[PDB]
Amino acid sequence: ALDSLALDLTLRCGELRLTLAELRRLDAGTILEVTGISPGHATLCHGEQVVAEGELVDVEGRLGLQITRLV
Amino acid sequence: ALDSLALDLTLRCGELRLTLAELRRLDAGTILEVTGISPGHATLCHGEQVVAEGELVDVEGRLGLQITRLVT
Amino acid sequence: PALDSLALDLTLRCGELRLTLAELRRLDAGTILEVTGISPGHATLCHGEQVVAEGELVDVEGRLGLQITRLV
Amino acid sequence: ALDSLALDLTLRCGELRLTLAELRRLDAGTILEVTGISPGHATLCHGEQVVAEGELVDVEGRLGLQITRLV
């Protein structure tokens, strides 16, 4: 009777800090380096809490997340 | 001095909805369908708010975000 | 500001060297010339002969990138 | 004019266009993508005139330009 509770989850595929002044100054075409993550890796999140780890995969041209570890 | 505010940003590579039951049935190997983003793309987020859109790139093995648009 | 829209043709500069006309005449394929001004992996961003930024050369999926280390 | 004339040459290892507004807005740590060149390639220039092409080489820690084509 709560098993049916629907959770909005997001894929967190990197983390970084910028100052507000830095963020205001970003232009299209510039690349931000996002250290701390293996490229294509994503964490499955509810808000700030991690629920699962995964890899971004191609599914017939669509984006999929293949779960590698439940957390 | 507010320009000096350090913001914790995330790269968001999509979203999905799962019930508590589904989240409980979830195991290694399961492929979940992702919505809200074209593949190879990501948004730059402060909490739940988008501040930019971009494309994921590889920079000598490190992940990069090539900004395509600032949400301003 | 109207001058903000000014398109500048900037150059990546990977150092410099001085040759006499005789030397440049003698210069054949395969010769390695010593470079001054930068150490390997570095470049300046240049407008004409004016340095406007310094940075590091990176590879972006087979493309050249300049990672800015300082704006001048 | 004589063979003893000394030319100040530069290594051009890429070209790009930014507006002044874009250039004003650049921050340390951001990456600019420089299309139209193979990484490590450089042209040897007198002003805006190409006199040679080559590859950037590391020789015992020191930067060199290995000449591939004379112009």
Curated annotation (Swiss-Prot), chain B:
Residues 1-72 are annotated as: HrcQb-C. Residues 24-27 are annotated as: Dimer-dimer interface. The record marks 33, 58, 60, 66 as: Dimer-dimer interface. GO terms for cellular component: bacterial-type flagellum basal body; cytoplasm. Its main location: cytoplasm. Keywords: Cytoplasm, Virulence. It is found in: Cytoplasm. One of its GO terms (biological process) is chemotaxis. Homotetramer. The four monomers assemble into two tightly bound homodimers. Interacts with HrcQa. Belongs to the FliN/MopA/SpaO family. The HrcQb-C domain interacts with the HrcQa C-terminal domain. Component of the type III secretion system, which is required for effector protein delivery, parasitism, and pathogenicity. Probably participates in the formation of a C-ring-like assembly along with HrcQa. This is Type III secretion protein HrcQb. It comes from Pseudomonas savastanoi pv. phaseolicola. The chain holds residues 55 to 126 of 128 of the full protein.
